[PDB]
Swiss-Prot record, chain C:
Core subunit of the mitochondrial membrane respiratory chain NADH dehydrogenase (Complex I) which catalyzes electron transfer from NADH through the respiratory chain, using ubiquinone as an electron acceptor. Essential for the catalytic activity and assembly of complex I. The keyword Chloroplast does not apply. This is NADH-ubiquinone oxidoreductase chain 6. Belongs to the complex I subunit 6 family. Pfam families: Oxidored_q3. Its EC number is 7.1.1.2. Keywords: Electron transport, Membrane, Mitochondrion, Mitochondrion inner membrane, NAD, Respiratory chain, Translocase, Transmembrane, Transmembrane helix, Transport, Ubiquinone. GO terms for molecular function: NADH dehydrogenase (ubiquinone) activity. InterPro entries: ComplexI_Subunit6, NADH_UbQ/plastoQ_OxRdtase_su6, Nuo/plastoQ_OxRdtase_6_NuoJ. GO terms for biological process: mitochondrial electron transport, NADH to ubiquinone; mitochondrial respiratory chain complex I assembly. It comes from Sus scrofa (Pig).
From Swiss-Prot, chain D:
It holds the Pfam family Oxidored_q4. It comes from Sus scrofa. Core subunit of respiratory chain NADH dehydrogenase (Complex I) which is composed of 45 different subunits. Interacts with TMEM186. Interacts with TMEM242. Belongs to the complex I subunit 3 family. The lineage of its organism: Eukaryota, Metazoa, Chordata, Craniata, Vertebrata. Its main location: mitochondrion. It is a multi-pass membrane protein. Its EC number is 7.1.1.2. It is an enzyme of class 7 (translocase). It is found in: Mitochondrion inner membrane. This is NADH-ubiquinone oxidoreductase chain 3.
UniProtKB/Swiss-Prot annotation, chain F:
Core subunit of the mitochondrial membrane respiratory chain NADH dehydrogenase (Complex I) which catalyzes electron transfer from NADH through the respiratory chain, using ubiquinone as an electron acceptor. Part of the enzyme membrane arm which is embedded in the lipid bilayer and involved in proton translocation. The chain crosses the membrane at residues 1-21, 29-49, 61-81. One of its GO terms (molecular function) is NADH dehydrogenase (ubiquinone) activity. This is NADH-ubiquinone oxidoreductase chain 4L. It catalyses: a ubiquinone + NADH + 5 H(+)(in) = a ubiquinol + NAD(+) + 4 H(+)(out). Belongs to the complex I subunit 4L family. It comes from Sus scrofa (Pig). Keywords: Electron transport, Membrane, Mitochondrion, Mitochondrion inner membrane, NAD, Respiratory chain, Translocase, Transmembrane, Transmembrane helix, Transport, Ubiquinone. One of its GO terms (cellular component) is respiratory chain complex I. Core subunit of respiratory chain NADH dehydrogenase (Complex I) which is composed of 45 different subunits.
Curated annotation (Swiss-Prot), chain H:
Belongs to the complex I subunit 2 family. Core subunit of the mitochondrial membrane respiratory chain NADH dehydrogenase (Complex I) which catalyzes electron transfer from NADH through the respiratory chain, using ubiquinone as an electron acceptor. Essential for the catalytic activity and assembly of complex I. The lineage of its organism: Eukaryota, Metazoa, Chordata, Craniata, Vertebrata. It is found in: Mitochondrion inner membrane. Keywords: Electron transport, Membrane, Mitochondrion, Mitochondrion inner membrane, NAD, Respiratory chain, Translocase, Transmembrane, Transmembrane helix, Transport, Ubiquinone. Pfam families: NADH_dehy_S2_C (PF06444), Proton_antipo_M (PF00361). The chain crosses the membrane at residues 3-23, 25-45, 59-79, 89-109, 149-169, 178-198, 200-220, 237-257, 274-294, 325-345. GO terms for biological process: mitochondrial electron transport, NADH to ubiquinone; mitochondrial respiratory chain complex I assembly; reactive oxygen species metabolic process. Core subunit of respiratory chain NADH dehydrogenase (Complex I) which is composed of 45 different subunits. Interacts with TMEM242. This is NADH-ubiquinone oxidoreductase chain 2.
């Protein structure tokens, strides 16, 4: 169950990031929306900065160092 | 080179299970014993496809089956179960060992009920 | 984001390194190296290397730089490249380190032989005559 | 953050106490009036460093005990300790622990 | 020079620690396990020069997974454009980004 | 390659440069070598932990131990040098020449 | 006589009584009347994060029992 | 020191070299280098005196710096590609870093300053060990990664080594410094052919090792460390001086002696790769090495320098300890030219 | 409320080490057929306050040629380490819960020698420098066997976490499982703190005194947790707190007991003691405790 | 035989710590190889699940792998509970 919830949450964050990137890059000339950086079409597990990149700094610090700093 | 494909936000909508970790831990054994088949579907498909985008339906299925399990537990023994989870929640490490007596009750209730 | 704490720690690392690289008053160079080692162990701890950072802080600082100071007194951008998944019910660093006795039999053999030969060599050199 | 705050608090309190201790008695007007280089201590420091390195090698034992290669891990740990004892014995018999 | 004693005797003295995708304890995977696996399968049994001319795509993918230069560059470009556009004042950030919106397990 | 790696390689560069400047005090040379090792350990640990290379977690320990062994060796030599001249000055090692 | 040593010792005990006990009360005051949840190994940390997200008040210790299942 | 301890240290040095030669993991190669350095220091300081201690300190500093540079190169190569195996270097910065590291380990110019002094400070046996055995591991490592090395840096450092050795050998009166500069020049000759053929490198290594072994054993037999001390050997054992003169002529690359075998072949292979200026420059430079070998031969065997009265007592004694394989080394280092095509064995 | 927790951890330790001096004086006096301080206060209960104020009012003697920097750094480092040591201790709940609490305490104890080294260097005296080098060598020498004993004992615990030591000794104390290791550990803790019989060596002096006595109470608390386990009931932590405090007080009174009971060693004598009696036996017991869980199939759970 | 016993006597006096250390070391070296519970410890280590057991895809030719956890097929942990 935790695995399934994790995939759904990650996919939701990726979709929101895609929507906001598409909104943001409507005017830049050579850009392409949601373009991969890999030659392969295999699924690549996203980084920490891919999901939380467009979010606030508080949640960024949480998602980065919450387990490390929790004592 | 290429565009990534992500499922729309509607495809990720499902009735999330809304209990805490202690509640899940208290009924973990019965959850595994009763909800094993859809969980095995989801886990095998997840380890075969290696793709989260190809395992949504099985996730919805396991959430639905977990909801069915919790609905039965709520219907049949709300009082016995509530006392047991509460004890688990109090412990910092959520140890099964600390409150054996509560478990004996819940188990027998379930053994009588379901 | 605490103003790139990893970047600040790295900057203090380089600052201590250039402080002790000028080589003034070798005791002061040892002080600068102590500060730099503490900062680097802090970098490792903040990254997630608890046991390796604590090894730095214990072995390096408490034995090696202590022996250096003893012999001296004798004389006159982050958060992005990080991971996504979890480790399980353990820590990957501890398991990889403890795999030394199961996988690194060759490594243990060569390191122990090197340590024994080092003891012998130290006695040989310090004999004198 | 918690450990950072604790370290900061300890350092600040120690600094304040030492500063007060060094300055409170300094406000009232008052009078205001080699070569040897022993080698045995250096040797003991060096052997301490080497034994500390061997201890660092020996440290991961508590997690090394769950590996399913119990014979191999036991043999390797006993080998490490045997070499440590052999180094101690060699330093002992070659007049290396004397005063 | 290289005396391949291990391959002659089948000893495996130090080959277990050479690559990320080789029998990690507790089946813990590497961050770029699949990329290195694919590169190794592409380049095995072919020689050096042929591996370098023909398996360039796999090595590019592996090095991108390792260092994420392209991903960081793209994210930095997105951040720069969003910051400039917010300084001009034509784009308003969504509630999810703000953190006002409720979380999902 | 992020900026923290740049900083660590820069620290290694200053350590090597300080080793090669050689004002005096061979003990400072040993200190520069040891700072070089510390920078190596820091960068190697960061690389190993970032990529989740589990079996590589042994490599820092080994490296540290070996370098520390070398450290002891150098100290011993330094002591003997001092015993011959009374000081660990660099210029006192001018007996052998090209 | 010898029991005259007891007063000062008592004070010492009282002093050594204060920290740990205080921590316990602190851990009971800040963690919703229960023990402070420990989190090693990154799995129970994920459990705590999930509980924090589920509660809705951004507090992990506000448990949502079966009455929250509808 | 204790004979058992000396045997253990020698075996440890050889085992470190073998570990470098037979390992496929970079950390194991570094460990072998560290073991070799750790066990080499007492060997250089077997006979205790300030000269030996200073030479050992110089050697330790140089080797520790080289090892640190090598580990930095390994770490960079791992960073830009998660690989530990000794193969293509995948990075130019790592390659140049480890190139300078191995050059400093081998004593190639401009890292040649430590070789004459370390050789002069230590005894003749320790000098033999340092100049023969300590060249196998770095050369093996260089041969393993010969496809990645930038030819410009290799060739520049090799030519600099040959020129520096040829120029520096002229000004020397001590025999150990002469040997050190000869080693530097021959190392440049070995290195100049690495980008093209490693078989030539190994053949030159074997020939050079045999020649320097014969020369060092002849120098140990006639206990002389200077040209003047060597000039007295004709009055006690002229056969030794004659064999020494033949070996010295061989070391200069004079045909039909054995020393002509590597250079010739090296030149040939370079002319196969359309490189004409460099082999010519190397030959005209090795003329200087031949010149100072000829000067040593003049002062050794071809003329009879004045002797001393106390040599008469030396006439009444014979060397109680005799080195084995010395005749074999001399014969191999003088008269194996007709079996040149045997190098197809990939020696 | 975390700052309040830190303050409530720090201040009681300072008060406890304030009154430990009076307890030591009274115990020594009554062990010497006399009384302790019983005039300043009802039973000397105000003596520590008088000593503190007198020390805080007296002129400090700067050597007029010493290096001020390390001279002022040393007491800061000593007191900061002494107060930091108390952080990981579970009584029964640690202020900061660490996975490697034991390793943290070991690293800080390793750092502890730097204050001695710097104070010796900054004294501008050759005799004091010799004394400082002597003390540092003794401390590191005993630190070796401290670390070895600690790891061999923890091999029956399963991890370096301090709280698990409470679960490990739920039924029996580890004093029964390994009393020789506990004996050598007690002697080693005596040796680290420069206490009798191993004690061979106004403001900054007072701070060094607080650091030393806080280290004493720390070491007694660590030994009590390590070897004399108490039963911790999650519904009432006060019982564990009282048990732990009583055992720590017993161990500290025992420290005063050995201080008042025996003469002191020579330096070469204690060095020989360690390197020729504790280290071989410590290595033998380390091998024994490595082999024991495997040979009896009683390996501790956590990994 | 008398020489070895006499040496053991002479070592037990005026050197008890070394005798005890060597005895404990020898026992720690030799005993585990003959103890019958090391196999039990290995089996206990094998029985600890740290990872998820990934099920295998069915093809109708695996009668020994259970289809449900409660099924009698598969490993049995009764031996550990009996300990
Ligand atoms: C291809 C690569 C070519 C590499 C170049 C060859 C390297 C040769 C030098 C290595 C050894 C040094 C040496 O023997 O003297 C130089 C030697 C000349 O003898 P020397 O200079 O008069 O000896 C002076 C020694 O320093 C006198 O020192 P000592 O009397 O104290 O030594 C005691 C002696 C006696 O050894 C013992 O005591 C044995 C006791 C066993 C100890 C137990 C240890 C086990 C753990 O042990 C040795 O001589 C060294 C043996 C080491 C074992 C090597 C296998 O020259 C050669 O060996 C060249 C021979 C031909 C090359 C090798 C074969 C061709 C290929
Ligand atoms: C064949 C030639 C013999 C003579 C030449 C000897 C050369 C020098 C001696 C060193 C070589 C010894 C070979 C040891 C290599 C280690 C690997 C081998 O032993 O297998 C290991 C078996 O381990 C053995 O127990 C090693 C024990 C040997 C060490 C004991 C004595 C050491 C002495 C060696 C020389 C040291 C200095 C001299 C000491 C007197 C692997 O264990 P295994 O479980 O299958 O696989 C683990 C991988 N998994 C996890 C994926 C399954
Ligand atoms: C467990 C609790 C332990 C508490 C620890 C101690 C906490 C500190 C308590 C501070 C106590 C107050 C100390 C005040 C007295 C200091 C000494 C004194 O009497 O000063 C006299 C001195 C003599 O000078 P002269 O007579 O002019 O010169 C003669 C020589 N030619 O005069 C002075 O300088 C007095 C200075 C003014 C002090 C007024 C304020 C008092 C200090 C407050 C404490 C500050 C920190 C809190
Ligand atoms: C002085 C103390 C330095 C180190 C203190 C912290 C040591 C430690 O291990 O705690 C790290 C702590 C707890 O982690 P774990 O125990 O592994 O469990 C958490 C997972 N649930 O978590 C952290 O990583 C936070 C701390 C990381 C950064 C802080 C490191 C300290 C940096 C100090 C720099 C200044 C040094 C000055 C020179 C010192 C020379 C005397
Ligand atoms: C095969 C197992 C090995 C591993 C186990 C050992 C673990 C660690 C123990 C070794 C640590 C280092 C030991 C170093 C030995 C030093 C010997 C020595 O030189 O000391 C002699 C003294 O000791 C000796 O005479 C040599 C050793 C004496 C024999 C020791 C015990 C031998 C074996 C006994 C037990 C055998 C096995 C157990 C059987 C019992 C039945 C079950 C000199 O003493 P001094 O300090 O100089 O003072 C002299 C002036 N008065």
């Amino acid at each position: 169950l935790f695995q399934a919830e994790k995939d759904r949450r990650v996919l939701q964050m990726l979709r929101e990031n895609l929507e906001e990137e598409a909104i943001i890059m409507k005017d830049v000339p050579d850009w392409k929306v949601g373009e991969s950086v890999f030659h392969t079409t295999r699924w690549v597990t996203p980084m920490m900065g891919e999901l939380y990149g467009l979010r606030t700094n508080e949640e960024i610090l949480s998602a980065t160092y919450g387990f490390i700093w929790y004592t | 080179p290429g565009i990534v494909e992500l499922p729309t936000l509607e495809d990720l909508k499902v009735q999330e299970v809304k209990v805490s970790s202690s509640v899940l831990k208290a009924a973990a054994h019965h959850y595994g014993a009763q909800c094993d088949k859809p969980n095995k579907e989801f886990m095998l498909c997840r380890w075969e496809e290696k793709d989260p985008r190809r395992c949504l339906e099985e996730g919805k299925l396991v959430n639905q089956c977990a909801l069915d399990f919790f609905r039965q537990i709520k219907r049949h023994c709300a009082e016995p179960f509530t006392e047991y989870w509460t004890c688990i929640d109090y412990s910092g490490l959520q140890l099964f060992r600390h409150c054996r007596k509560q478990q004996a009750k819940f188990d027998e209730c379930v053994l009588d009920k379901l | 984001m605490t103003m790139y704490i990893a970047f600040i720690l790295s900057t203090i690392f380089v600052i201590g390194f250039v402080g002790f690289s000028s080589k003034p008053s070798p005791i002061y160079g040892g002080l600068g190296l102590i500060v730099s080692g503490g900062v680097g162990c802090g970098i490792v701890l903040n990254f997630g290397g608890s046991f390796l950072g604590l090894m730095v802080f214990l072995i390096y600082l408490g034995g090696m730089l202590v022996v250096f100071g003893y012999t001296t007194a004798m004389a006159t951008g982050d958060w992005v490249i990080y991971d996504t998944g979890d480790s399980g019910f353990f820590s990957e660093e501890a398991m990889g380190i403890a795999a030394l006795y199961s996988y690194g039999t060759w490594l243990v053999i060569v390191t122990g032989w090197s340590l024994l030969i080092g003891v012998v060599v130290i006695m040989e050199i310090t004999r004198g005559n | 953050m918690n450990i950072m705050l604790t370290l900061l608090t300890n350092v600040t309190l120690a600094s304040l106490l030492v500063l007060i201790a060094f300055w409170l008695p300094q406000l009232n007007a008052y009078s205001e009036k080699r070569l040897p280089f022993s080698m045995k201590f250096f040797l003991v420091a060096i052997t301490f460093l080497l034994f500390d390195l061997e201890i660092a090698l020996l440290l991961p034992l508590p997690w090394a005990s769950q590996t399913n290669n119990l014979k191999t891990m036991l043999t390797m740990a006993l080998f490490l300790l045997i070499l440590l004892a052999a180094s101690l014995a060699y330093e002992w018999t070659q007049k290396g622990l004397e005063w | 020079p290289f005396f391949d004693v291990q391959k002659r005797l089948g000893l495996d003295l130090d080959r277990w620690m050479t690559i990320q995708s080789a029998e990690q304890p507790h089946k813990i995977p590497g961050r770029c396990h699949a990329f290195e696996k694919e590169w190794i399968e592409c380049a095995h049994g072919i020689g050096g020069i042929r591996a370098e001319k023909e398996c360039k795509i796999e090595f590019d993918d592996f090095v991108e997974c390792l260092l994420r230069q392209k991903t960081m560059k793209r994210l930095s470009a997105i951040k720069r454009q969003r910051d400039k556009l917010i300084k001009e004042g034509k784009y308003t950030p969504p509630p999810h980004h703000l953190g006002k919106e409720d979380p999902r397990p | 390659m992020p900026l923290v790696y740049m900083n660590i390689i820069m620290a290694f560069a200053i350590a090597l440069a300080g080793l090669l400047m050689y004002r005096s005090h061979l003990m400072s040379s040993l200190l520069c070598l040891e700072g070089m090792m510390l920078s190596l350990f820091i960068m190697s640990t960061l690389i190993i932990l970032n990529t989740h290379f589990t079996l590589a977690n042994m490599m820092p320990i080994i490296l540290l131990v070996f370098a520390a062994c070398e450290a002891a060796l150098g100290l011993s030599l330094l002591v003997m040098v001092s015993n011959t001249y009374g000081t660990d000055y660099v210029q006192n090692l001018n007996l052998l020449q090209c | 006589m010898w029991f005259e040593i007891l007063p000062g010792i008592a004070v010492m005990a009282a002093c050594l009584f204060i920290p740990g006990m205080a921590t316990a009360h602190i851990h009971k005051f800040t963690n919703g009347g229960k023990e402070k949840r420990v989190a090693h190994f990154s799995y129970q940390w994920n459990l705590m994060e999930r509980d924090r997200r589920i509660s809705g008040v951004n507090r992990y210790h506000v448990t949502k029992g079966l009455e929250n299942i509808d | 020191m204790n004979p058992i301890i000396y045997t253990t240290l020698i075996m440890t040095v050889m085992s470190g070299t073998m570990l470098v030669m037979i390992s496929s993991h970079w950390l194991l190669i570094w460990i072998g280098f560290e073991m070799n350095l750790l066990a080499m220091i007492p060997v250089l300081m077997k006979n205790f005196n300030p000269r030996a201690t200073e030479a050992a300190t110089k050697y330790f500093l140089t080797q520790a710096t080289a090892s640190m540079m090598l580990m930095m190169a390994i770490i960079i190569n791992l960073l830009y590609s998660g690989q530990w195996t000794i193969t293509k270097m995948f990075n130019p910065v790592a390659m140049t870093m480890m190139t300078m590291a191995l050059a400093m380990k081998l004593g190639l110019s401009p890292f040649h300053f430590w070789v004459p002094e370390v050789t002069q400070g230590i005894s003749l046996q320790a000098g033999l060990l340092l100049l023969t055995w300590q060249k196998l591991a770095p050369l093996s490592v260089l041969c393993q990664i010969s496809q990645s090395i930038n030819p410009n840096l290799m060739l520049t450092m090799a030519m600099l080594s040959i020129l520096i050795g040829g120029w520096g050998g002229l000004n020397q009166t001590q025999l150990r410094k002469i040997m050190a500069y000869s080693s530097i020049a021959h190392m440049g000759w070995m290195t100049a052919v690495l980008p093209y053929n490693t078989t030539m490198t190994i053949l030159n290594l074997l020939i050079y090792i045999t020649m320097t072994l014969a020369m060092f054993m002849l120098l140990i037999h006639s206990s002389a460390t200077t040209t003047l001390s060597l000039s007295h050997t004709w009055n006690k054992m002229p056969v030794i001086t004659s064999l020494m003169m033949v070996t010295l002529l061989s070391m200069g690359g004079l045909p039909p002696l054995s020393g002509f075998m590597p250079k010739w072949m090296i030149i040939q292979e370079m002319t196969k790769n359309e490189s004409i200026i460099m082999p010519t420059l190397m030959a005209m430079t090795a003329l200087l090495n031949l010149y100072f070998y000829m000067r040593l031969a003049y002062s050794s065997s071809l003329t009879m320098f004045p002797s001393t009265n106390n040599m008469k007592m030396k006439w009444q004694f014979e060397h109680t300890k005799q080195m084995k394989l010395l005749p074999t080394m001399i014969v191999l280092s003088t008269l194996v030219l007709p079996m040149t095509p045997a190098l197809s064995s990939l020696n | 409320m975390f700052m309040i927790n830190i303050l409530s951890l720090i201040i009681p330790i300072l008060l406890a080490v304030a009154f430990l001096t009076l307890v030591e004086r009274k115990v020594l006096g009554y062990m010497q057929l006399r009384k302790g301080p019983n005039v300043v206060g009802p039973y000397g209960l105000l003596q520590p306050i008088a000593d503190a104020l007198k020390l805080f009012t007296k002129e400090p003697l700067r050597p007029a040629t010493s290096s001020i920097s390390m001279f002022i750094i040393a007491p800061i480092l000593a007191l900061s380490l002494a107060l930091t040591m108390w952080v990981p201790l579970p009584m029964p709940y640690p202020l900061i819960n660490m996975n490697l609490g034991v390793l943290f305490m070991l690293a800080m104890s390793s750092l502890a020698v730097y204050s001695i080294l710097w104070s010796g260097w900054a004294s501008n005296s050759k005799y004091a420098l010799i004394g400082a080098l002597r003390a540092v060598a003794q401390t590191i020498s005993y630190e070796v066997t401290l670390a070895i004993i600690l790891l061999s004992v923890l091999l029956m615990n399963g991890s370096y976490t301090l709280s698990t030591l409470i679960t490990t000794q739920e039924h029996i104390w580890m004093i029964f499982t390994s009393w020789p290791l506990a004996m050598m550990w007690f002697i080693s803790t005596l040796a680290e703190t420069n206490r009798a019989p191993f004690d061979l060596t106004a403001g900054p002096f007072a701070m060094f005194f607080m650091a030393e006595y806080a280290n004493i109470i720390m070491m007694n608390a660590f030994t009590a947790i390590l070897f004399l386990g108490a039963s911790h009931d999650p519904h009432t932590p006060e019982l564990y707190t009282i048990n732990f405090v009583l055992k720590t007080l017993a161990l500290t009174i025992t420290f005063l007991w050995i201080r008042a009971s025996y003469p002191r060693f020579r330096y070469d004598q204690l060095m020989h003691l360690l390197w020729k009696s504790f280290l071989p036996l410590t290595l033998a017991l380390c091998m024994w405790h490595i082999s024991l869980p495997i040979m009896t199939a009683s390996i501790p759970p956590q990994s | 035989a008398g020489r070895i016993a006499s040496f053991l006597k002479n070592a037990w006096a005026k050197e008890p710590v070394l005798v005890a250390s060597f005895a404990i070391g020898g026992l720690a070296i030799i005993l585990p190889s003959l103890s019958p519970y090391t196999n039990y410890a290995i089996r206990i280590n094998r029985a600890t699940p740290y990872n998820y057991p990934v099920p295998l895809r069915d093809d109708g030719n695996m009668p020994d792998v259970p289809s449900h956890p409660q099924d009698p097929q598969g490993p049995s942990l009764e031996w550990l509970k009996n300990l």
